[PDB]
Amino acid sequence: EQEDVLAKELEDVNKWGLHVFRIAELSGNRPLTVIMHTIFQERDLLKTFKIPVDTLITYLMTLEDHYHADVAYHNNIHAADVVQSTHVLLSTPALEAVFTDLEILAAIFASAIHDVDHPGVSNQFLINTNSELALMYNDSSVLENHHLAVGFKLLQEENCDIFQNLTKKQRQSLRKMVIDIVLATDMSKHMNLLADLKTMVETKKVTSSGVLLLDNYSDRIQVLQNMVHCADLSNPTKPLQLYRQWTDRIMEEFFRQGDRERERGMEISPMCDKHNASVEKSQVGFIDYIVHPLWETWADLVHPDAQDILDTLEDNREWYQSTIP
Amino acid sequence: VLAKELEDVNKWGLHVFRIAELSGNRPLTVIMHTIFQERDLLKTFKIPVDTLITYLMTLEDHYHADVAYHNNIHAADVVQSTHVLLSTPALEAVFTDLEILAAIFASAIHDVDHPGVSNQFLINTNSELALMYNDSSVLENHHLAVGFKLLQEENCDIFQNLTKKQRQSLRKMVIDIVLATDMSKHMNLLADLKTMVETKKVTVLLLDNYSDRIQVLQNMVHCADLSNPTKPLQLYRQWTDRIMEEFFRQGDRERERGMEISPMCDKHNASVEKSQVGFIDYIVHPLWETWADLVHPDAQDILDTLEDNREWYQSTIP
């Protein structure tokens, strides 16, 4: 019976606002596995790339295991949400037939691994505390390099190489695209990434069929980079009952980092002091300075495919603002 | 004795192989020690001389003695070459004492724990290093990580009496410098050096913002990394012998694995002399001529020796 209800909920996999928390509960805290498996079936990726079903499940379960269940936001539910949001963004009409199967596989795989083994603290916290991760990665995209290294390493575990039947050229291309995509999820690259997306929007070319014209790697990877970045920053664009749960979880994570910064005599990071935080004003500023500028630009790139998502974002911003006065 | 040769530490063409032999295979230590005294670094930064020695020894130990080129003698050579370039007249005290310390420390660690194979080899063999570093400046990220981690060994933190902000600043400059020694970044680096030359301002060089000053320091250590063909011929020839030995050993590993043999790495199909002339024509002379322009004309004798050495190598080709 519980499997039947889960199957009903997975019928929403192509919809923005999938009940991802319900799916995590109904799947036994396996949202990343079941949503990834569902999307691979939906896009015929097992047949296209000759991925053994048992190998796919084994990798997904291992990958999902390496997300921290004790981190409130950057956990396997977040990963599953970014995977499913990227899957929906890949289906946008303005991009129909634009990307190859290998690029679709790269974008979805990158989304699945993009936060694996996240410890629930920021890059700056890891740098400032002289963590082994920051020492390993020379303070440069510390978390994001780590997510990549773990996500690829787990392919080497027993019956986990889901890319075993790709050609060597296919594997090499996929690996580079996945690295390029996950490194672009570093928030310290957001401004430069949005600047380039804006440049592409103002110089955008479309084909005779009306889809976006991307005729070189730089343009192609930049669209996939911004797509996964939008998916990563998609919480305020979702139905409010989903958005508010994400806000609760990120604030829990922030406050826990602030508690450790406080116990260390460090200056507390912005939005991380539970004694002097405004959750509502922080969301309004997050939308106003980061999320709406990004999604407004994405919406321009794929116009008018994303108008409903942009409208939800604007409604939710009005709602969070309305709770301030 | 060893003290005799060390007095040339301020001279281009120091006898680093003799120093390496006379010092019991500790050229990096004794040359780093000597350079710190020459610049007054142990007192400028309150470095306990024993802590300096303990770190430098541990660092030297992490260079591989069985790697023919990228070993502790190479590290010593780049340290001393950078040291000399820091005293270019056109750069009179242009860098702060921390920027000086960062360039020298970066030089000393810039190849530590080098396995004697290229980044591309590590990528194509699915090495643990390339998996860790996502195929991006694999060696250079590792050199930095090792160089910094060794500061955490007992009595090895030579920066213990730097302030918190001095450490953070030094760390960033060292990382920026060592990452720029990746040879895949050479062309972008040269373009920035050229731009700086075409827009140079002078009284002596006037570099106002960090971005220009880190670029000079990056191209400086890059020059010191690529200085072998600008040294006296007797030193240059020993460097050529060592790099070709390391290249051929990589090409043998590529052959025993049946992978494609890297350029200049096929011992059954390599012209050592033509490779050197091509190396100078396409890489070393463009870089050192651009640098010579920047410090016009304080690099004249270095550019002269390079052109002398290129002529000699060309004359060995029938």
Ligand SMILES: COc1cc2c(cc1OC)[C@H](CCc1c[nH]c3cc(C)ccc13)N(C=O)CC2
């Ligand atoms: C649901 O809500 C959130 C979700 C997320 C964040 C913040 C949220 O809410 C404040 C932060 C963003 C941090 C951040 C980086 N630069 C910024 C600049 C500004 C102005 C504000 C925030 C940031 N994340 C951290 O992993 C991503 C997910």
Ligand SMILES: COc1cc2c(cc1OC)[C@H](CCc1c[nH]c3cc(C)ccc13)N(C=O)CC2
């Ligand atoms: C003494 O001589 C050498 C010393 C060194 C090298 C090559 C030497 O001699 C052929 C190579 C340079 C790699 C390289 C990158 N692009 C190139 C293009 C050309 C044309 C040649 C070489 C290179 N190194 C390897 O770590 C640095 C030291």
Ligand SMILES: [Mg+2]
């Ligand atoms: Mg992340």
Ligand SMILES: [Mg+2]
């Ligand atoms: Mg190197």
Ligand SMILES: [Mg+2]
């Ligand atoms: Mg100034």
Ligand SMILES: [Zn+2]
């Ligand atoms: Zn994320």
Ligand SMILES: [Zn+2]
């Ligand atoms: Zn070197």
